[PDB]
Amino acid sequence: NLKDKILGVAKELFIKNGYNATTTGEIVKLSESSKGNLYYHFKTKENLFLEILNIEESKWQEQWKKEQIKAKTNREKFYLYNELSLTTEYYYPLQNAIIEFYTEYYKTNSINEKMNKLENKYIDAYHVIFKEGNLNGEWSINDVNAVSKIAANAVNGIVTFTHEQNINERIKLMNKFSQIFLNGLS
Amino acid sequence: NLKDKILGVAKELFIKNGYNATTTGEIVKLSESSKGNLYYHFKTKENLFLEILNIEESKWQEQWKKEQIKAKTNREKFYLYNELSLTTEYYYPLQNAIIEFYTEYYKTNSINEKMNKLENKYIDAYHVIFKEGNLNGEWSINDVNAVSKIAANAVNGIVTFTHEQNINERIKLMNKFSQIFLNGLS
Ligand SMILES: N=C(N)c1ccc(OCCCCCCOc2ccc(C(=N)N)cc2)cc1
Numbered sequence: 001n002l003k004d005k006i007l008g009v010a011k012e013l014f015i016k017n018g019y020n021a022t023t024t025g026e027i028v029k030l031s032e033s034s035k036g037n038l039y040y041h042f043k044t045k046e047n048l049f050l051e052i053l054n055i056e057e058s059k060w061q062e063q064w065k066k067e068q069i070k071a072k073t074n075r076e077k078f079y080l081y082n083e084l085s086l087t088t089e090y091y092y093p094l095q096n097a098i099i100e101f102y103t104e105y106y107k108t109n110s111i112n113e114k115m116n117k118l119e120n121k122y123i124d125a126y127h128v129i130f131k132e133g134n135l136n137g138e139w140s141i142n143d144v145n146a147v148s149k150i151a152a153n154a155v156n157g158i159v160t161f162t163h164e165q166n167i168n169e170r171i172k173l174m175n176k177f178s179q180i181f182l183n184g185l186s
Numbered sequence: 187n188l189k190d191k192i193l194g195v196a197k198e199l200f201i202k203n204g205y206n207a208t209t210t211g212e213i214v215k216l217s218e219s220s221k222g223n224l225y226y227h228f229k230t231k232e233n234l235f236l237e238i239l240n241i242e243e244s245k246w247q248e249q250w251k252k253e254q255i256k257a258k259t260n261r262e263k264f265y266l267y268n269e270l271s272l273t274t275e276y277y278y279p280l281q282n283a284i285i286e287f288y289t290e291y292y293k294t295n296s297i298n299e300k301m302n303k304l305e306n307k308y309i310d311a312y313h314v315i316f317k318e319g320n321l322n323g324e325w326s327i328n329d330v331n332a333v334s335k336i337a338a339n340a341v342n343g344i345v346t347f348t349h350e351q352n353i354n355e356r357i358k359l360m361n362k363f364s365q366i367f368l369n370g371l372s
Contacts, residue, residue: 099289103204103282112350119347143362150344150363157343158336161281163288164298164305176329177336184370 003041006031011052015093019049019100049101050114056094057121064125074133078151079178081125086159086174090167123152139185151181189227192217197238201279205235205286232291236300239280243307246276250311260319264337265364267311271345272356281346309338325372337367 009031013022024045028038042048064081071077089095105111126148133139141147158177162170195217199208210224210231228234250267257263271278291297312334319325327333344363348356 096289099285100204100206103286104207106282106350116350146359146362147366149348150359150366153344153347153359154340154363155343156347157341158339160285160346161339161342162335163292164302173332173336173339176332177340180333180336180367180370182370184366184368 002031002033002037006033006038006041006048007052007055010048011094014049014052014097019097019104022097024048046101046105046111049097050111050118052094053098053118054121057118061121061125074129074136074138075182077129078126078133078182079175081129082155082174082178083171085155086170087167089159119152123148126151139182141185147185154181188223192219192224192228192234193238193241196234197242197280200235200238200283205283206290232287232297235283235287236304239277239284239304242277242280243304246274246278247307247311249274249276259324260315260322261324261368263315264312264319264368265361267315268341268344268360268364269357271341272353272360278342278345281342305335309334312337325368327371333371340367 006027010022010027013026013030022045024035024038027033027048028035038048042051064084067084068077068080071080102115106115127144130139130141130144130148130151134141134144154177155174158170158174162173165173192213196208196213199212199216202208210221213234214221214224224234228237250270253270254263254266257266288297288301291301309331313330316325316327316330316333316337320327320330340363341360344356344360348359
């Protein structure tokens, strides 16, 4: 599983030194693989990275699946998931390498394409919550996909453009948002 | 021009590339000058940047007023500000850039001050719209600043993380957002 070993070493290198400074050379030697093996599995560093991001997205889903059982109703799942997105990124190691990578390829439709497939995976969480909320009379939404992209992006905005305020303040605003939003659906 | 020529080329590269991707080296050469230049008015690099942000924030908040007249109620004002956010050429095209900046100077204090003193200029627009809406009885918000902040960030989110798809689809979501947010306020 040196494909797996490469993803691992790469994740760590990226975390320690960021996207730009990490060279496939380091990855090659530290994972005891080769330029060729690395080329055959990911073709480029960008792809390698995107690959990691999907693995990460997967772990996040897996995590959410276990964590969402703490929330009985969908209203609750909405409140909870948003809180998680805020508190977890506070200490997500890849966070900084992602920003680096993102704000460096959002100009390439090639990379930008896959970047959306990934983004869409994170949006499904909402889609599910919303779909389920319907089938339980918690709310009635006839445009799930829509409200889903909206929630996703609104929430990511609160997580991304607030950092400085103290952590409780943020959690507070987020929960406030989760309230206002959920309220304007009934 | 002298000073107001660098600022120009700067803003240009800060958007075209990242905050790091672009450096004084590039700015100087493409703005035909020397290093010294960038020192009396332009101390640090984050000085020239923090500057540019200020310019853009002002330009935007001004274009807003030279355009909010087209909205009789505040409910409409809210909607319009958010819709316009998506089409301007001011401030918002630097969110990606700002993100890097903040995530590379959040370890210092001279940042969480300007980078936070600008937050007022950023949420003011919503504060007025929400306060005035209270006097005008369109709604009743007793935690304006919270709501103002939550909105400023939710919106920035929708504008920033959808920036690469059908511009008219953006405008649609943004309106379903304004719709849903306002409906949750009462
Ligand atoms: N192994 C772990 N311990 C771990 C892994 C992943 C993780 O991930 C946290 C992820 C937060 C993701 C927020 C994504 O927000 C958006 C994504 C896409 C879009 C879009 N529509 N373009 C908008 C917001 C946290 C922990």
